Design a protein around this nucleic acid. Structure first.
Length: 108
DNA sequence: GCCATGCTAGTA
DNA sequence: CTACTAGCCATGG
């Protein structure tokens, strides 16, 4: 399966995530038949263009947190986008932004 | 070819 | 709950 196919598949999936809901790299990976490629779902996201109709903000990690960026602290920009969709987000004891995954996670 | 970068399940 | 590890895998130098 071509990388550009994957990349397409992924975006297709993300866009299916309803307003106010969320998903995760892994789940998306599995959704589109590429279970081991969670990191690459990362990649996909990171490669979109800032002015995109894609709900990249609806995608977080397995642990229900928002993931630190080795480049570009717009993880802030991700929290904000969620709070508008109405999403209780708590900084963990450390400065991590967490949320009640079971409550928010989405499934077709 | 190697080696650094940039999610997750499992174990302690 | 927090660590820390093993394994994963495209991408670019």
């Amino acid at each position: 399966m071509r990388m550009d196919e994957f990349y397409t598949k992924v975006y297709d999936a993300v866009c299916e995530i309803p307003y106010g809901k969320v998903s995760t790299y892994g789940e998306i990976a599995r959704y589109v038949g590429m279970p081991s490629y969670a990191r690459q779902v990362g990649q996909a996201m990171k490669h979109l263009h800032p002015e995109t109709h894609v709900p990249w903000h609806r995608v977080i990690n397995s642990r229900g947190t928002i993931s630190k960026r080795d480049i570009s602290a717009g993880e802030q920009r991700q929290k904000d986008r969620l709070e508008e969709e109405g999403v209780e987000i708590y900084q963990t004891s450390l400065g991590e932004y967490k949320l009640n995954l079971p409550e928010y996670m989405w499934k077709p």
